[PDB]
């Protein structure tokens, strides 16, 4: 089997991407944030505290003839941005782009933090990291990909995120029309539960490439590119007036600037992030200070190849017996 679904930016900044997912019988379609940095499929639901729902579409398990309470199971998650959610668990039929898993754990939120309530466009998350990170207790549950894997034509999924435009998540096949040149594959460590790999270096604009190992994660659920402070300082030094602002929470730059590109290494290959991808617009409405898309990972504890980086590539998440990541230009 295979599946193919379109993923769409939630806003004009590409803060996140949503992908429609069918849950239950008859289908209930929710728009979920596919997140290769976590491993829970959780949704706003008929059980979510009413004052914490503000425009999201909810899953109602009592209206699904295939939903079953997973007795005694609970879940609770906290994300790198300080947001959180928790609740109980059902199993139900879940389909993505024509690919169906029966008995998928669907984690129903009883509580969500304010940042989830405030984002009316995201109805929940669909985790695509390794199932060892799944938070369900006392019986840990498998991701949608993990459950689908054995049925797929090939044990892979691909992320093809758009810049200010729709893109695609495919399961079970590699669309050879979706990228240019060849796909360069690189080793993955699953020891922390992430799609963790080592970039071979970087360049800023038309500058020379610096060969240096940068260990980080491929995370579709993180908006920005978070890299070591040395690398980030070298980038922003090329932008007149750019500075790190503790009051704003990162590097800012004049909105009048034209940003340089940023290149990252994948083995001997190179992925070029155009400068425009690094512009996140005014820090507040009407401001002439703009927020940067490359930020320091210092004080996160891990480097994160988030959407800013991933959207410049066609990315293969290879879940073969020894997982690997592939990157191609597009
Ligand atoms: C204008 O965009 C922003 N402004 N201020 C802080 C931000 C943070 C922390 N992130 C991730 C974005 C996209 C920001
Ligand atoms: O301020 C912000 N702080 N954190 C994330 C943000 C995302 N966008 C678009 C803005 C303006 C943000």
Curated annotation (Swiss-Prot):
Disulphides: 255-290
UniProt keyword annotations, A-Z: Aspartyl protease, Disulfide bond, Hydrolase, Protease, Signal, Zymogen
Gene Ontology biological-process annotations: proteolysis
Record's catalysed reaction(s): Hydrolysis of proteins with specificity similar to that of pepsin A, prefers hydrophobic residues at P1 and P1', but does not cleave 14-Ala-|-Leu-15 in the B chain of insulin or Z-Glu-Tyr. Clots milk
Active site per the UniProt annotation: 35, 199
Occurrences of domain Peptidase A1 (ranges): 17-328
UniProt EC number: 3.4.23.22
GO molecular function, one term: aspartic-type endopeptidase activity
Record-stated family: Belongs to the peptidase A1 family.
Official protein name in the record: Endothiapepsin
Source organism per UniProt: Cryphonectria parasitica (Chestnut blight fungus)
Part of the intact protein present: 90 to 419 of 419
């Amino acid at each position: 089997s295979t599946g193919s679904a379109t993923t769409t930016p939630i806003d004009s900044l590409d803060d996140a991407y949503i992908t429609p997912v069918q849950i239950g019988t008859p289908a209930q379609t929710l728009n979920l944030d596919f997140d290769t940095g976590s491993s829970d499929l959780w949704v706003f639901s008929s059980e979510t505290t009413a004052s914490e729902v503000d425009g999201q579409t909810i899953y109602t398990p009592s209206k699904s003839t295939t939903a079953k309470l997973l007795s005694g199971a609970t879940w609770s998650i906290s994300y790198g941005d300080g947001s959180s959610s928790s609740g109980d668990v059902y199993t139900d039929t879940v389909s993505v782009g024509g690919l169906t898993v029966t008995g998928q754990a669907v984690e129903s939120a009883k509580k969500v933090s304010s940042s989830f309530t405030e984002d009316s466009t995201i109805d929940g998350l669909l985790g695509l990291a390794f199932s060892t990170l799944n938070t369900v207790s006392p019986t840990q549950q498998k991701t949608f990909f993990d459950n689908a894997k054995a049925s797929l034509d090939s044990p892979v999924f691909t992320a093809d995120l758009g810049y200010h435009a729709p893109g695609t998540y495919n399961f079970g096949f590699i669309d050879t029309t979706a990228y240019t040149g060849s796909i360069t594959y690189t080793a993955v460590s699953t020891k922390q539960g992430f799609w963790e790999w080592t970039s071979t270096g970087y360049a800023v604009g038309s500058g020379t490439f610096k060969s240096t190992s940068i260990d980080g994660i491929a995370d579709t659920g993180t908006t920005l590119l978070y890299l070591p402070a040395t690398v980030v300082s070298a980038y922003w030094a090329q932008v007149s007036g750019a500075k790190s602002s503790s009051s704003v929470g990162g590097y800012v730059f004049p909105c009048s600037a034209t940003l340089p590109s940023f290149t990252f290494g994948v083995g001997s290959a190179r992925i070029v992030i155009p400068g425009d991808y690094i512009d996140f617009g005014p820090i507040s409405t009407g401001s002439s200070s703009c927020f940067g898309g490359i930020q320091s990972s210092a004080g996160i504890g891990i480097n994160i190849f988030g959407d800013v980086a991933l959207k410049a590539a066609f990315v293969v998440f290879n879940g073969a017996t020894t997982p690997t990541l592939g990157f191609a230009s597009k």
